[PDB]
Amino acid sequence: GIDIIECENLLKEMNVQKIPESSLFTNIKEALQAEVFNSTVEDDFESFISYELQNHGPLMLIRPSSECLHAECIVGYDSEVKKVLIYDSNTSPEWQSNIDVYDKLTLAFNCSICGLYYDGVYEP
Numbered sequence: 394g395i396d397i398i399e400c401e402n403l404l405k406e407m408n409v410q411k412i413p414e415s416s417l418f419t420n421i422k423e424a425l426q427a428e429v430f431n432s433t434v435e436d437d438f439e440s441f442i443s444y445e446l447q448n449h450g451p452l453m454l455i456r457p458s459s460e461c462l463h464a465e466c467i468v469g470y471d472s473e474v475k476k477v478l479i480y481d482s483n484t485s486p487e488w489q490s491n492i493d494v495y496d497k498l499t500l501a502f503n504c505s506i507c508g509l510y511y512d513g514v515y516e517p
Contacts, residue, residue: 394461409510417441449511456501
């Protein structure tokens with residue numbers, strides 16, 4: 394992982410911004426406070442991830458690690474197998490289970506810098 398200052402500098406140099414508020418993002422952030430992964434919130438999760446990938450494109454997730462942070466990039470979704478395609482940013486992205494990704498978002502949203510970011514350069 395990387396320290397806060399290196400992380401701040403990364404986001405600045407990338408020129409990314411936090412994703413905007415939406416009903417789907419509101420609903421998922423509520424769930425992430427306390428709800429364990431389940432079939433019902435999975436629908437909310439899939440709706441949110443698909444919406445963000447469709448409208449904003451790749452999403453950079455900054456989450457806590459030490460006081461170190463991890464930057465990961467969400468870049469795909471497969472509803473058939475319930476997996477998310479993610480870079481641990483190394484060279485090639487990998488498919489991760491929805492439960493693992495949901496648990497990562499719980500860390501990021503349950504650290505002002507933590508959250509999800511998008512890049513206007515890659516906006517669909």
